[PDB]
Design a protein around this ligand. Structure first.
Ligand code: ANP
Ligand code: ANP
Ligand code: 3EW
Ligand code: MG
Ligand code: MG
Lengths: 274, 310
């Protein structure tokens, strides 16, 4: 119950890219891992102990559809060490490589994703940052959900106050999360909303708000309830029971959205049904 | 036009001819200039021609079809040749990053210059508003492309006293790919754009106004300064956009700036785009008519402020 990796253990290699709260390097550590050099460079010792606690809970997470959290380091700089996926992010498949999956396999991707999410909520873990960039397709088949939790390194602390600076990608963000108006905007249904957007990806082959090209325009209108993903764009042959499920996750008021126990259930029903 | 500009404009075209195909091995990194939430910029030396340029690197994760369109659209920038637009050498793609190669402006963006200076003098903001009004004109008339992103960090200035615009929406597909950026700190987006659509040049004029205020006082002006913070002469991104839409626009202090200036920015910050001033009107406003007559020494004020020798 004190998980830290020392220096000289982690062979930091190629610079892979940067996200909403760190920069990732492919490192080595008893095999390929993923080394994410957090953006909170100088951690306050009140922030530093909250991070330690949260790593404890991410460490005890073990699920087929979850990327293993292997602990962290602090030697050069504060960082994070997780499994290395040889797959490509679902985002890459859908919007860059434009992989041509069958509807049978699309629905399976949705099923395993709700499968993993359901375990996280079962262990009372809010992802906070569920998007198709954080979903890899390991060996081109299994789904693996990374970048979960970690509320304390995505908050930029003052001295002892975690005031969540809205960051992440604005798509996938539930309206109440956009607004940052009521304390704990991140909730199990904020994740369901995110999940619903990822269904939109799967069912349409497009990101939401394709006809809008203004970052701040989307932030304001979605937060105000004026903007909503155009479900018209769902492909011709996507199940009727599927589109309805997507629409329930996208409800503007969080309390109307379903939780994952029910959501996963819904997916398995239309799964065998064809 | 005049004679010192027709020289500098034609002298660029000559060095630009010395540059042929832009390849990533023809470049030698010198220093980092700045970074943003979607790009980083380096001062670099083009070995085949020794030119020193600036080289912005945008790492986008887009499909190649979209990417190759972006590169194509970015070649219209070989037609933008104005003393009020940053020089453009070429754009290309390599190693997963779009490079845009522009001329070095050794003073930096006014957003850097604001930090080194704290506040900027109205006499200087006078000459600045001139350049930005000329730059936006040349873009609406000669190219029918609108900047769509006027902010202090897109106004570039150099030691020869030039003020130039850059980072303007010429690539309509880059605009689409920019839209999946994460949240920023703040926003210079006019209130109609946050609701509707780019309302011709008028929606750029708002941005220029907001930017004049921020540079005039030394603080992003949303929300407006406190009662005693002002006599001393943090908000969520969503709430700023809600304030820009559902609250009266910012204004200049009180007695600290002229009335010509206070009025100039007040006409720029009208929340209705149609009632807002247009380029034709700002061009002959009192504050602009005066600040054009003033013989301000900009190049000197800049090098002073940066900390160099005139
Ligand atoms: N565990 C991992 N294994 C392999 N590649 C990874 C891993 N985690 C992230 N990456 C890649 O690293 C790059 C950037 O990572 P990252 O910082 O997570 O950005 P992001 O996931 O797109 N946004 P966010 O996760 O919300 O901060 C992308 O090309 C990812 O596909
Ligand atoms: N030609 C140039 N000469 C000198 N400095 C430059 C030049 N182009 C860009 N810069 C600097 O690079 C910095 C950041 O680049 P940029 O990607 O435009 O970010 P930004 O405009 O400041 N903010 P953002 O639009 O949110 O990314 C600017 O603040 C300038 O100081
Ligand atoms: C959205 N969008 C559409 N077209 C664009 C465009 F041409 C851009 N670049 C550019 C244009 C003219 C000159 Br001169 C110099 C440059 Cl570097 C940028 C841009 O670089 N924004 O900067 C954000 C941070 O990277 C954006 C564009
Ligand atoms: Mg990721
Ligand atoms: Mg810019």
């Amino acid at each position: 119950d004190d998980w830290e990796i020392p220096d000289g253990q982690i062979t930091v290699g190629q610079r892979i890219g940067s996200g909403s709260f760190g920069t990732v390097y492919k490192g080595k550590w008893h095999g390929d891992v993923a080394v994410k050099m957090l953006n909170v460079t100088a951690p306050t010792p009140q922030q530093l102990q909250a991070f330690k606690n949260e790593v404890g809970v991410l460490r005890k997470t073990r699920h087929v559809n979850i990327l293993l959290f292997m602990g962290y380091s602090t030697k050069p700089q504060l960082a994070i060490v997780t499994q290395w996926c040889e797959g490509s992010s679902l985002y890459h498949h859908l919007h860059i490589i434009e992989t041509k999956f069958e509807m049978i396999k699309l629905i399976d991707i949705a099923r395993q994703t709700a499968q993993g999410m359901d375990y996280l909520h079962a262990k009372s873990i809010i992802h906070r940052d569920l998007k198709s960039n954080n979903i890899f397709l390991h060996e081109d088949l299994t789904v693996k959900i990374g970048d979960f939790g970690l509320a304390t390194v995505k908050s930029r602390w003052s001295g002892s106050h975690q005031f969540e600076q809205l960051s992440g990608s604005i798509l996938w963000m539930a309206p109440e999360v956009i607004r940052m108006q009521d304390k704990n905007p991140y909730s199990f249904q904020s994740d369901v909303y995110a999940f619903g957007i990822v269904l939109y990806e799967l069912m349409t082959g497009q990101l939401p708000y394709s006809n809008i090209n203004n970052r701040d325009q989307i932030i304001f209108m979605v937060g105000r309830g004026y903007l909503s993903p155009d479900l018209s764009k769902v492909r011709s042959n996507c199940p009727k029971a599927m589109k309805r499920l997507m629409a329930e996750c996208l409800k503007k008021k969080r309390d109307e959205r379903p939780l994952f126990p029910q959501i996963l259930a819904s997916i398995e029903l239309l799964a065998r049904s064809l | 036009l005049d004679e010192q500009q027709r020289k500098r404009l034609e002298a660029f075209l000559t060095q630009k001819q010395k540059v042929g195909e832009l390849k990533d091995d023809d470049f030698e990194k010198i220093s980092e200039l700045g970074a943003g939430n979607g790009g980083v910029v380096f001062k670099v030396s083009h070995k085949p021609s020794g030119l020193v340029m600036a080289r912005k690197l945008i790492h986008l994760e887009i499909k190649p079809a979209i990417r190759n369109q972006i590169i194509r659209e970015l070649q219209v920038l070989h037609e933008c040749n104005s003393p009020y637009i940053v020089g453009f050498y070429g754009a290309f793609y390599s190693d997963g990053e779009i490079s845009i190669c522009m001329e070095h402006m050794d003073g930096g963006s006014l957003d850097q210059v604001l930090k080194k200076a704290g506040r900027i003098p109205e006499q200087i903001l006078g000459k600045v508003s001139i350049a930005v009004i000329k730059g936006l004109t040349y873009l609406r008339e000669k190219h029918k492309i609108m900047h769509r992103d006027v902010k202090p960090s897109n106004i570039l200035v150099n030691s020869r006293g030039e003020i130039k615009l850059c980072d303007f929406g010429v690539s309509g597909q880059l605009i689409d790919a920019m839209a999946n950026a994460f949240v920023g700190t703040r926003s210079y987006m006019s209130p109609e754009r946050l609701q509707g659509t780019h309302y011709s040049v008028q929606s750029d004029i708002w941005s220029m106004g907001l930017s004049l205020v921020e540079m005039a006082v030394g603080r992003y002006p949303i929300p407006p300064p406190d009662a005693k913070e002002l006599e001393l002469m943090p908000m969520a991104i969503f709430e700023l956009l809600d304030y820009i839409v559902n609250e009266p626009p910012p204004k200049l202090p009180s007695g600290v700036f002229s009335l010509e200036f206070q009025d100039f920015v007040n006409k720029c910050l009208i929340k209705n785009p149609a009632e807002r001033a247009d380029l034709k009107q700002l061009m002959v406003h009192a504050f602009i008519k005066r600040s054009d007559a003033e013989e301000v020494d900009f190049a000197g004020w800049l090098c002073s402020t940066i900390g160099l020798n005139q």
